[PDB]
Amino acid sequence: VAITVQGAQLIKRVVERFYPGIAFNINEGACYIYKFSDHIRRIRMKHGTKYRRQAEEIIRNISLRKERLYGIPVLDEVEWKYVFDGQTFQSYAFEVYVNSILPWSELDPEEEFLRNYRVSREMTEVEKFIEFRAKNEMQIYGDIPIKVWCCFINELSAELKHVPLGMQVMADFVNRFDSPFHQGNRDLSNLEDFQVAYTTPLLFEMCCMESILEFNIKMRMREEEISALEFGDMKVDPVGLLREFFILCLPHPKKINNVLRAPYSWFVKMWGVGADPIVVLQSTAGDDRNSKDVFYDKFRTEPNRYKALFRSSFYNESRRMNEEKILEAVKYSQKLGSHDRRLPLFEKMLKTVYTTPFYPHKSSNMILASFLLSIQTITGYGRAWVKNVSTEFDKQLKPNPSNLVQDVSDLTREFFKQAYVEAKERREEIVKPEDLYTSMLRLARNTSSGFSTEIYVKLIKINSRIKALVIFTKGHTVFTDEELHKKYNSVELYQTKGSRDVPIKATRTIYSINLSVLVPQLIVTLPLNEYFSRVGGITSPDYKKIGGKVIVGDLEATGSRVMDAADCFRNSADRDIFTIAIDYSEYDTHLTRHNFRTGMLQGIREAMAPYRDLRYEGYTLEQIIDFGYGEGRVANTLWNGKRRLFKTTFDAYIRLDESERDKGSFKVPKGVLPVSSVDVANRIAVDKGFDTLIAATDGSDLALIDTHLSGENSTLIANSMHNMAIGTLMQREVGREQPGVLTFLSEQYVGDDTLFYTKLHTTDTKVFDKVAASIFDTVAKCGHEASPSKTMMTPYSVEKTQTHAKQGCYVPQDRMMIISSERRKDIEDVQGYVRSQVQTMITKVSRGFCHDLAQLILMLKTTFIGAWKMKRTIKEDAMYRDRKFDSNDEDGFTLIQIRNPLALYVPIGWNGYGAHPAALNIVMTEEMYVDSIMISKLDEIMAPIRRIVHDIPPCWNETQGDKRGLISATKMSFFSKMARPAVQAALSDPQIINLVEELPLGEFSPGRISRTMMHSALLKESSARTLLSSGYELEYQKALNSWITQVSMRLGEESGVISTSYAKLFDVYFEGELDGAPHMFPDQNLSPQFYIQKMMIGPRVSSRVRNSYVDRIDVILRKDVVMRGFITANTILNVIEKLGTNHSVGDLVTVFTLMNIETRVAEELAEYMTSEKIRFDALKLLKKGIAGDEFTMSLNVATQDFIDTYLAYPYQLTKTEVDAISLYCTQMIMLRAALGLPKKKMKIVVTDDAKKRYKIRLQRFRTHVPKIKVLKKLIDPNRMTVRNLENQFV
């Protein structure tokens, strides 16, 4: 019944399916197979090299399958045909798909999403453009080949005895059409040779996702032991609904999913609000509606006061919009295909959404609610095509006495002035001219660099984009008068647009801006970006300060989704709160110069009036304002992007003359022929006569933009501030037209999203309708467009920032991708990467996902990540050595490595991954391992992994390779401005001082600081990192052949360091019967392994324990502008270990200033270090990421209440030592709660026998003193802790 044996058998059968005839053994930690490749052999043969048997090494291997190389068997990867053993199911979805195929004659090249275009055996010029489009927009990426996923689906279907529809259509396709394409393992983005249709990889990805969701819903259903899901009092089947969705969305996947994702969310938001009895969970916090101190009592049912209101016209139109939206999508899907099916269950359920009650305390409804929001996860990353369009000024709304545009501009200008004053109040000010040449590195994270720079390295020329290299090369030219007085509105100067994908929606466009525009923007906008980062403000409408109103930046500060968003649960639990959410459409489009830009410019202009006495190299501030924003600089600018092309015949190009055939500078796609201008394109373009495509090349189709840009340095602040103005106008108008009906209690502004918590003083339908009409009338006259179909106005349901709450309980939606990925990634560090995915899977399972399927997915992924990526090394007689010889007789062979799945459950430091089989939130560590093996209950769980330890080879990791083999030829010309006067002082000397600059500072020394900074900048660039990756194979060979099968479990540590193994010095007792009363919690959709933890231990109701000494060091280091991105606390402590702690404040100030730390941070760090050295122990605690995941953030652990309740420890211990105890205590108590053990208090015990006390004293003394290193650093033993340890335990 243990998961460790079932998963082992599962993955074993998957491995034997993937590689037939495998010699895989469960009891061995690794396996090695050979693979043969002929691609290098051919290219060697064309140089006339002589080889032995050519295709024989193919034919003899594929057929007989018994040839051996140095005794190690050689196998070939299994064919596409036999992945599902040739079974068929004649599924209707297959004919639905093949009916949706389209010939090339119906091409619309400007399509956002590609349709199901057929692939012909012969070639044509338009098919080249189709191939070019498909290669880019149809990439899967990810980290695991799709065939491995298909094998896993087949095996798990065999295990669970159920047949997903996705596997059915998969088998139906492969039974006749054989391979879809070819994918390489060394680089998964090499998809090539499309066989049948250009949209096949989308089919495979969607079918695997659908099968994963079908498995997950069935296993989660079995966990709760329910027979069917429930809607009201009616039974419903989830797999039926999922198949019903899947069959309909298949004609045109991306478009249908994008147009259909909204009604499903609206139904979930609107479910159960109008029921006569309502079940709510009590929650109580502070007076403010954004208090974060909630606590939960119990459930109750209450009558609904709002029941009579739901006969309103507004709700009827809201429902009717969604019925039209579902029906038009169904009609389009039926028309494109050859089917007459529809969505009967969903339209049946939509008919009575209001009156059917919602039951948060019944899992049959909560699972359904969570599943409907997670359905949309089958069309990830939504790559799309975008077109360049100008500003079209004619449709802009002119200000007239019937609108509110001038009022919006005036109020937003007043808000800029007020916010600037508020930022000045918080000692945040604009940059000073003394800081002009050093603050340019402080650009916001949404910024982008316009011009890429060229670097010579020693030999090779390369290009780079990141701010550091471009600035360090050409920063002095940024402010020069030549670059200031130029405008980007002609052919000679222009800027290009980029694009980045998003997980579900269409690809988002971004703007690249030259640094000469960004820096003047930064000069003014830096203090406001700094100031608005703070949290915890008051959001009452009658409060003067506007700092707390903006929620931008007030997200993920705690780090837990459930913890920081508790106001949603609190407001949804309150019957007296009415919540309103306005959803705008094309917000960034409607920020015009009539309403937004001019008032903002005026706010900045009369903002800098008190600073008019300052000058910047002759220029004054109001000239810098025009430098940052102005015509030809930000507004009224030309922009380049995707080309525009038109449909013509072939021979029309032949009748053209050479004036229309002149090819310009701009590049054109593969399958399109050039043409001079767009005018001749309009003359020649013919619609019915599709034979060829032509694209203009003279630059007449660039975009003219006079609208707010997403790449600017103040986009979020401006957007939220504009929304503040809009909300002020909305409140003013609703107060004026309908006095006293609606009172605003809280207003919330983040991005384009707006939220209101208000009190409604009436239940009459006609008053509510007039109020809603007034709101929509006001927002319409204001210039924007507000959709009445998405705008939400509800008593009991609250949504913000993709977070949903219904009746005081958390309804999670899961959008975490598992198969695909946003961009291609290369795994520099396998172990940290697997750590990252297991951390993300913790979040996924915390969002309602099944725990066992998560374990199975990690069990799969832990085996195949390291495979296929080692090369130019061969193994013979258990010895690794370089690839054969110069004989070139076995040159075509490579070695592939397969890891034991159970390596997922062996701790870090033992070459493994720190996951725990009992629950994923517990981190394996050596002490945790020995504790688990000493527990008698876990033996059956721990039995297989007992024999798998001490067999794991070292993991692939290119990150620790650090050498000097990347000498650059380009130099740091701007160094004369980057170096602090501390650095600038020690380079004017005639090398006399050079010989006395012998402090142990390492690479940060005068005469070498510039080179080391440049070197680090290159190592930030991956295209520069790729040069040193060649030599890492030899070091990996050294790591392999230096490995010895031995487990060390060194519970000691480096004497400067302390870890959680320290608690293993003492024995641990469990006594006392604690209270068994269960606690309440809002998230009622968890796995039982997590549910037991959330019930035994309540939610966190306080701040976590005080930050560590390293945390304080990092916070102090977060004050230096130029070194925050270059200095961590580890870098400081590494220098300190050689420098020593026995120094005065002046010594440390001088040392830090020499290390490019500015003198104020130097003084602060020196004083704090002196205080810590004099007062406390000062040892840094190393933790294995424990208590750092998503779920542990929400538990009542690692807090002072937790220590006071659950822990009793001797008083002789120090604060760092008791913290090291406390983390182990949290881990142990979490593990005991997970196993269902009785709740008992835990104590650390020290016995009366003398010999144990002698060893404890010896160990503590050797731990607190770094032995012979006391000579190196001359640390005075007169520090309080070490001097006090003389007779602590005597």
């Binding site: 001038q406 009022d407 005036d410 109020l411 200008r413 007043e414 002035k417 004053v421 009369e606 009036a609 008190p610 006495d613």
Partner: protein
């Protein structure tokens, strides 16, 4: 309408030493349309006494 001279509230002595007036926040504001209409009403009341 004529605004008062800005030097009444602030005087500069050196590069970075300037006096601050008690009502800098109020003088930094700009009237809206309704406030401008109210100012016009106040003046119209002033020119016609009773």
């Amino acid at each position: 309408y004529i605004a008062p001279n800005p030097r009444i509230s602030s005087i500069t002595l050196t590069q970075r030493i300037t006096t601050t007036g008690p009502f800098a926040i109020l003088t930094g504001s700009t009237p809206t349309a309704q406030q401008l209409n109210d100012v016009r009403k106040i003046y119209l009341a002033l020119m016609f006494p009773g």
